[PDB]
Subunit: 337 residues, 4 copies
């Protein structure tokens, strides 16, 4: 029976002790402490060696990425790539700390665009009329000048030209995940999440990749250079096989919608994830998948019955850097080659 | 009493414009007239007032849609690659999957059955659970039922609703022969499948007037769902492909189809229930015409985490997705409560004109 | 096992059938249907006769109000009196349909002020600077000209004069509930909730009655006419005895904060309410009493273990008129004398 | 590609002012420096950015408070009826009851112990659970624990926290003799009890440096709680009055005490954790000076239902509760996560000046 007790600042500002104290502070501070424990359990599983039998079964993917004792799926909505959590996610991917990424179209394109031009701080209350008259697009309390997307068009159209040519003369069958690997190779910039993902053979799934600026560009491009196909069926096999042949899986899901459901549904194919942390502000009462508690996923078989999943009800821009500080960042040496 | 205090609390006020509307609730001393009760939400305040504003926005869409036009039928079909005739207002209706598991399925089905909207957008669950409900029902439960006991009994939870695993076994038996035919048609009849084309096929096959997608294909209302693999239809396509390889679902052609629905519209309205892809994909299509003319959002998401789901309509104005001169409305509510009321006051009142 | 099925508009717009269909529609529509059932159960208990033994025990209050088989506590936050739900609540109180009211200071004063001047529709986004420069106060998307409070001051100061005089020459010991009955008698207007409450011997509790414009006025008044006392201890005995000697109780609570906790805590004194409906938009995850589910109150003994309470997660301006339409309003003849 | 479509999507943009701040998160290739990590929230966006803005607002309060003044000590005490000396910024700290059950109790206690704020406002639970924690602890649990089983074991739930019934039995034994003395002092020494005066007495009696209210009375920090009867202290006053009748708690005199704290301030700041009375009562006091100079809200309430709890700081500007020229901040978060971080970056950095 653990007693409630908050950090005592009479001790001074001892940051690690202050963070450790969230576990006995209560409400979402305690859920944060539980999330640190769940993620550290994923990491300590991941670093355990594969036995001969485990290695046999897990080798049954055709994937270039070396397999580990715990395959970690990291999912996040577009807004988090607009935010500075882009840097947090880039770090994890750069150091091979996670194994599969799932994001929406915005979460791909805004990473690449930030390599061409920055996003700026604003306010939620800025009025749409005056912004639109000035070509400034609003993302929460962030601002993206539309010139950013004009730079994106310039950068992307030559790649689209090459992709159709490789499709039609070299037999390439494009999928969202194959396109995202190509885009990461092209951006060729170490600040980019997708640069490191393709370098480290970390696949990125985004079944609705046409829902965004990338879609705008493909759409415009298709009038002059018709026939690009993006197949989502092959990518469904690819993500599902990541779960099916894992020794263990963990899910770290930031936000809701397709990124949350698609990771969870893949893990149903192995009868459930072993570890899971949600971080989002959605609420269950309207029945949405976004606001469903981890225990709903247990009824489907998406999380194992014997798992101890946790949801932190909070804006991930506040807690995800703190979570990484207390978990992956303390084990960085183990992830380096 | 301190003089500055008195001056701060008892400050003079300007007179408000003469057309300012007073707050006043429905008076049950009149008895119960449900029409008058709903009309009274407009002057009740808070989200009741936004509901009244949403009635007005949707009634404006409908009245626009009912205006005659003269436009060349053959060129419209050619630029949109669609058999659907243009009207004076193209209405896009988007809804998340949970609402198809709820009884809002019936509400949506009624609108599509009577050809009252022009474009549907939903996620994968919002397709498959309409079809599965023609095979077996969904049941009432509670949000607090524990997942371990449910899982051990083969029962899956959707909010406070429940669906047995066996529903999906029936879905599998129904779907597998259709997937066989789709692969045969792709490989020997040149069909280039996309989600919308598959959803039209599935509605024709289910052949059941309780289904949204049966009515949608009958009435030539396309359904866009660019992540159609993310659910049970996905599971089935996946298992089927190891028995019968080769099905492809392209999303590029469906992007051309939805965007041209917005580009070549005379007017557009957006009615969006929930967040995620369904909200963003409709709004982004409408950026292609420099913005929708009318818009109603009904969802429970909040802006403060920067999510697109929680963004107010005025964020969409900044992008060009809603016109600067539109008067869009968001109702902050569970759509299971307010969408039937909204339909009662709008489309269902205009049923005569839709014949 | 009840199947999900929504209202079919092919039947036409049959309003009562449409409302009845919320119960099988799911999510908060089903919780609304359950709330209709809980409230109708309060009403059908309330109309059951008191047996001789029940009548004996329930007569042990010194209260002028005739006792009934189910004592219904109605609680609501200030914003709902600013809104047109003021009319809904006035109707229930006018026809003796509820037995105890609990509200905050704003929920008293705005009822009285609406008898002097109206509240107007506005928008949530109106900016505070321009409003303040014009003396317009904002309540959500409603607007109250500050002249309304100047009219309140004019109306109220003579009553405060009389109350101190009766305190100091006639032995009157003021409490919030006694002041609210007096204010309702003085406003003498059938549009006012508190007019009907005092006429029908329905007590109104508001332990923090000084937190609002009423407080402002008492404060200003106390410089020229010092010594008014408002005792909250006596009002605590009064509300608790309403629960202790009830045959059955129901709680209908709109909103959170003190109105919710104070009704629930009174009912702990009888080992729990028999029926309960919450309607509010607060969420449980921060640990607040406002966002606690009814099942939290069960652990305290504030709701009986064998009750079937329900929370509707929604803005009460949308659902409370619908709830009243389906419950109290259909039994109006039984409440008339 | 349709020309209007291209023009709508590829619209030119104005250049933003040169001092515009770029978004950029903390880079863990630097390793883990927690100070730099917290500083990085300012440029991370969404509520992380509001957290950084809240650090700045509170640091501005503190810096103002540390400015010297010359003001007549005797007249200030007479107009406020308070022994507390005036400083250059009077800070009001408000917090709902649940936060005293959480470990935020320790955070608040530290601030009051070091005399860093001037006025506390809390609800009844926020008083009594501080005192009870000096008798017996609160435990960690889960939100989903069922009330029937808990009730049958005599365990009471507060969110995901748990407190046994026996905690309140210990409270009863401790409190009853003190209530006896209060009635004796009212009836034969002329004491006119109010909530603040009772809370000062209870803090002196608990005599325990882990208690917020022990430190508050030692440092002459008044605690306002105008519905002090709404909780366990209420239960005890109630049961006690049938054994020893006559205790009165007046709220009118406490209204005079809190309002004069705002009226006679040089500057004020408001730090408000949660909603309800604690938020409204501090803000209303500050209307008496035509508005607070600085304000930080931390709560999870939303505006859309019109509640005062969910109102943004800009609503308070319309009333005169926050000055038109202030730059107030709300962080949309559970205070159990962000208040210790906020204190770490503000008051706890200034500990040297507060000695």
């Amino acid at each position: 029976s653990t007693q409630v007790r908050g950090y005592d600042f009479n001790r001074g500002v001892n940051y690690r002790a202050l963070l450790e104290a969230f576990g006995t502070t209560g409400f979402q501070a305690t859920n944060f402490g539980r999330a640190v424990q769940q993620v550290n359990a994923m990491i300590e599983k991941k670093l355990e060696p594969l036995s001969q039998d485990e290695d046999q079964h897990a080798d049954l993917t055709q994937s270039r990425r070396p397999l580990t004792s715990c395959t970690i799926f990291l999912g996040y909505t577009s807004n988090l790539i607009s935010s500075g959590i882009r840097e947090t996610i880039r770090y994890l991917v750069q150091h091979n700390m996670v194994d599969v990424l799932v994001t929406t179209a915005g979460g791909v394109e805004e990473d690449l665009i930030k390599c061409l031009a920055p996003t700026y701080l604003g306010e939620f209350s800025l009025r749409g009329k005056e912004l639109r008259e000035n070509g400034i697009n609003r993302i929460g309390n962030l601002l993206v000048p539309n010139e950013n997307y004009c730079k994106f068009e310039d950068w992307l159209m030559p790649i689209l030209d090459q992709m159709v040519m490789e499709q039609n003369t070299e037999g390439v069958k494009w999928t969202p995940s194959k396109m995202i690997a190509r885009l990461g190779k092209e951006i060729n910039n170490p600040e980019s999440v997708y640069y490191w993902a393709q370098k480290n053979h970390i696949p990125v799934f985004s079944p609705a990749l046409t829902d965004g600026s990338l879609g705008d560009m493909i759409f415009f491009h298709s009038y002059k250079n018709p026939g690009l196909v993006l197949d989502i069926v092959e990518d469904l096999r690819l993500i599902n096989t990541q779960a099916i042949f894992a020794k263990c899986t963990g899910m770290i899901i930031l936000g809701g919608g397709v990124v949350k459901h698609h990771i969870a549904n893949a893990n149903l194919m192995r009868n459930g994830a072993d570890y899971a942390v949600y971080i989002n502000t959605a609420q269950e009462f309207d029945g949405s998948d976004s606001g469903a508690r981890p225990d709903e996923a247990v009824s489907w078989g998406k999380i194992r019955v014997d798992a101890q999943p946790v949801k932190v009800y909070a804006d991930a821009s506040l807690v995800f850097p703190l979570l990484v500080a207390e978990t992956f960042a303390q084990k960085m040496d183990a992830f380096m080659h």
